[PDB]
Design a protein around this ligand. Structure first.
Ligand SMILES: CCCCCCSC[C@H](NC(=O)CC[C@H]([NH3+])C(=O)O)C(=O)NCC(=O)O
Ligand SMILES: CCCCCCSC[C@H](NC(=O)CC[C@H]([NH3+])C(=O)O)C(=O)NCC(=O)O
Ligand SMILES: CCCCCCSC[C@H](NC(=O)CC[C@H]([NH3+])C(=O)O)C(=O)NCC(=O)O
Ligand SMILES: CCCCCC/C=C/CCCCCCCC(=O)O
Ligand SMILES: CCCCCC/C=C/CCCCCCCC(=O)O
Ligand SMILES: CCCCCC/C=C/CCCCCCCC(=O)O
Ligand SMILES: CCCCCCCCCCCCCCCC(=O)O
Ligand SMILES: CCCCCCCCCCCCCCCC(=O)O
Ligand SMILES: CCCCCCCCCCCCCCCC(=O)O
Ligand SMILES: CCCCCCCCCCCCCCCC(=O)O
Ligand SMILES: CCCCCCCCCCCCCCCC(=O)O
Ligand SMILES: CCCCCCCCCCCCCCCC(=O)O
Ligand SMILES: CCCCCCCCCCCCCCCC(=O)O
Ligand SMILES: CCCCCCCCCCCCCCCC(=O)O
Ligand SMILES: CCCCCCCCCCCCCCCC(=O)O
Ligand code: NI
Ligand code: NI
Ligand code: NI
Ligand code: NI
Ligand code: NI
Ligand code: NI
Ligand code: NI
Lengths: 155, 155, 155
């Protein structure tokens, strides 16, 4: 409720990539509505020509991975480095744009941008994990050390 | 680990709408379990009478958009205005309640609450984007200006 | 942009459980790719032997609930108690590991870990709600009281 300082400046790159990510998903959503119109595939029903089913499955897959991306983007960028995480985030979303576009053309044209997208996601997870190790490990090691020394009143 | 100040008060409306959103999704989930019972549609399998397939597809669609909603709600409410974002959030979730209820009755009875829900989501994205522009633009413009003036030792 | 204090230490358990959650989902994703290979079920297409359809449906269900889990984990852990929320989070994810593994074997072998997972999710929602009540209620009650007393210049 104020507060005479804010933490916006530490997370704005993350928020910018996050917004970009949302805009990407809405774009994917518009394409599926477009494919539904082109091939007359009506709500409910998610089956039809393989083409339609590739665009629909493309959107579904991106949606499933979007929270995973968001989660690791925020943990990595808060526990490791904002800029690095934001950069991997960019690569991830661009790869995902390629994945969608390719899959719409062909199943096989989804594979390479999928591999790009997973490497970038893997990098975020690695950064996040390292960032959390740096946070918990020193206190843990010290507590272990502060337990075995005792010894005590000897040694 | 304390810290003698917290930022809860800046985000509590956002957290309240977020919790409301979760409760809505669980409600949707309970209805699908109810529709599965009524029409004997057993796990796995997501096909059956169109009615069941409308309630099931209703839940699926809300689930796909829920992270997008959450993301933009938090960016908008942190970079633009908490109260405004929380309000749009309310409208979004109410529209989504209508969408679900309507779609359960009819495909065509999902359309108007869908249009309401997308306008509200659009407003959050707009707020988020404006909020981020306000944050990055001034520093960017100044840096551009601080580059071309030089001139320098003339002018 | 610094800032000579950080709030990492208040949320690191939450971030740790969140990362664990992401790793779990990626694990689920790898199993579905494995089941696709075993039973030759090719992208797009999400139908096949019931076995494959149980592993696929297992992943889908976890994905749908993962943002709900994340949302309530963060609200609960910020508005109620970090450690408690992180603990419920652990139980939730372990239950979810069991759910996946069971469902892969049998539909009926998914039920008990599902009940565990929903109780844990229910606990997080309860904590979150209590935490938010504690935050809004006192200010609300006082404002109500500060309205009816007036009376004023009497009583
Ligand atoms: C760094 C961690 C990486 C995370 C796991 C990598 S596995 C790839 C991932 N596999 C899945 O999502 C499995 C389920 C998917 N929903 C499906 O039906 O095939 C995928 O892209 N599936 C769809 C596709 O292959 O296009
Ligand atoms: C402000 C940004 C708005 C975001 C994009 C708007 S498009 C509407 C949106 N379209 C989709 O989600 C496409 C995929 C959807 N899963 C489907 O199978 O039809 C929708 O509501 N689909 C289901 C439906 O029409 O009921
Ligand atoms: C504390 C709040 C709890 C939230 C609601 C509990 S209902 C259980 C939940 N039901 C659903 O998700 C409904 C939709 C689901 N996608 C489906 O097709 O069956 C579930 O686990 N469905 C799949 C399954 O039964 O395995
Ligand atoms: C995972 C999806 C998006 C996550 C966004 C949540 C990040 C919030 C952290 C920073 C905000 C701290 C308090 C608010 C400060 C302010 O109002 O300026
Ligand atoms: C996107 C889904 C929900 C996002 C929630 C994340 C928001 C967290 C920002 C504020 C918390 C700052 C540190 C904790 C302060 C405290 O413990 O009181
Ligand atoms: C819901 C998915 C994950 C949510 C993660 C968002 C939580 C952020 C809150 C704490 C961060 C506050 C500002 C950053 C401080 C820092 O850089 O050390
Ligand atoms: C340091 C590099 C960070 C790049 C993130 C920028 C996000 C751009 C989104 C428009
Ligand atoms: C106090 C308990 C600490 C456990 C969290 C460790 C997280 C490491 C994740 C890599
Ligand atoms: C807390 C400050 C550092 C404690 C000692 C760390 C020991 C292990 C470091 C590698
Ligand atoms: C200023 C208006 C903010 C409204 C958000 C309130 C959320 C209500 C959820 C119960
Ligand atoms: C320093 C790089 C700034 C790039 C982020 C700009 C985001 C604008 C989004 C509207
Ligand atoms: C940093 C403070 C403001 C810098 C100058 C902004 C110039 C463009 C403003 C419109
Ligand atoms: C206090 C208990 C908190 C437990 C959360 C630890 C997360 C472990 C993830 C590796
Ligand atoms: C000022 C408006 C407060 C409304 C939010 C109340 C949230 C309670 C949720 C349990
Ligand atoms: C603000 C401080 C406390 C205000 C009075 C709370 C009255 C209701 C408490 C139960
Ligand atoms: Ni003040
Ligand atoms: Ni202050
Ligand atoms: Ni102190
Ligand atoms: Ni302090
Ligand atoms: Ni300084
Ligand atoms: Ni400071
Ligand atoms: Ni602070």
């Amino acid at each position: 409720m104020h507060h005479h300082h804010h933490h916006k400046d530490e997370v704005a790159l993350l928020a910018a990539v996050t917004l970009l990510g949302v805009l990407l998903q809405a774009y994917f959503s518009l394409q599926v509505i477009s494919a539904r119109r082109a091939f007359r595939v009506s709500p409910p029903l998610t089956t039809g020509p393989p083409e339609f089913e590739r665009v629909y499955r493309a959107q579904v897959n991106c949606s499933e991975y979007f929270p995973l991306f968001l989660a690791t983007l925020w943990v990595a960028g808060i526990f490791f480095h904002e800029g690095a995480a934001a950069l991997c985030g960019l690569v991830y979303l661009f790869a995902r744009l390629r994945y969608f576009q390719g899959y719409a053309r062909s199943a096989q044209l989804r594979l390479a941008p999928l591999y790009a997208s997973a490497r970038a996601l893997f990098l975020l997870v690695a950064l996040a994990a390292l960032g959390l190790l740096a946070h918990f490990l020193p206190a843990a090691l010290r507590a272990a050390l502060l337990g075995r020394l005792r010894t005590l009143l000897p040694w």
